[PDB]
Design brief:
little secondary structure; 2 chains; virus; part of a larger assembly
């Protein structure tokens, strides 16, 4: 008598990146490296 | 630390004219440079 362990079937997971998704169309993703120095980034708009 | 003002973004308003609009098809618009001297203005209609 015996047991017959069959194969360890590893699941390989789908890899997702931010830019491959369509939430990147809602974003404007920028790498900025001195961001741990900036407090609050200000956009100024000039509306006539 | 810093404050990080981003770029100033100016509005450019859609420059309309009177004749691009559809009010101009209700209009028969005429310049008359001596119009300030109009006391009145009239149109006589003779109807058979």
């Amino acid at each position: 008598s015996f047991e017959a362990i069959f194969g360890t079937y590893c699941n390989k997971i789908e890899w997702v990146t931010f830019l491959g998704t369509a939430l990147a169309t809602a974003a404007h993703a920028i790498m900025f490296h001195d961001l741990n120095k900036m407090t609050t980034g200000k956009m100024l708009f000039y509306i006539q």
